């Protein structure tokens, strides 16, 4: 029902220092629930050290004009391109406003990365059971189109970019300072 996709393959030999740096913007996304049709914008700043990922997350609800901020922490898998995190809720200043709920986690897989582009998959879980998943194309630049390598990776798993929501058209509002100041 809320079962996460199979055939999500972590990139071989991801350059960690490059991927886990700076800010990434979602440019296209595909929620695997066809009824999940609310428009959102997303950006994040993932960092890694000693086999642990610490990331700052930003979402913006286009419909309601409400933004929310989270941080996530968890171990990086031995393959170096997949991690599972627990998360809390913070305000725009980075201060915790709601503690992590033990029953929830998410698993991010980096499927492909090339130049200024990447393709990721996220699986949300409750008590270790799948509750839903999503694919996202990322770019360093809000308005940029994906590298062909990202399209190749989509093709390998029988997805086509035309099915994704494109957010550059949406009235996105970003908190870039929250992400740029992450772990500063
Ligand atoms: C790229 C496109 C993405 C979209 C469109 C999206 C959309 C959403 C939506 C609609 C919600 C629920 C908001 C609500 O209940 O009002 C949500 C929650 C959440 N998402 Fe995303 N998401 C994306 C990517 C990600 C990624 C890549 C991560 C982790 C790296 C992530 C982590 C979370 C977390 C932790 C929550 C729950 C926050 C809370 O309950 O306080 N999301 N997202």
Author numbering: 2 to 185
Question: What is the paper's account of this structure, in its own sentences?
Answer:
Here we report on seven crystal structures of NP7 at low and high pH and with different heme ligands. The overall fold of NP7 resembles that of other NPs. Eight anti-parallel β-strands (A to H) form a barrel that hosts the heme cofactor including the ligation by the proximal His60 residue. One of the most interesting features of NP7 is its ability to bind to negatively charged membranes.
However, no significant conformational differences were found between the X-ray structures collected at two different pHs (5.8 and 7.8; RMSD = 0.22 Å), even though this might simply arise from the packing of NP7 molecules in the crystal. Overall, these findings suggest that the ill-defined heme density of the unliganded NP7 reflects the movement of the cofactor inside the heme pocket according to the two coordination states. However, packing effects also explain the large structural similarity observed for the different ligand-bound and unbound structures, although such a structural similarity does not permit to rationalize the effect of deletion of the N-terminal residues on the binding affinities of certain ligands nor the pH sensitivity of NP7.
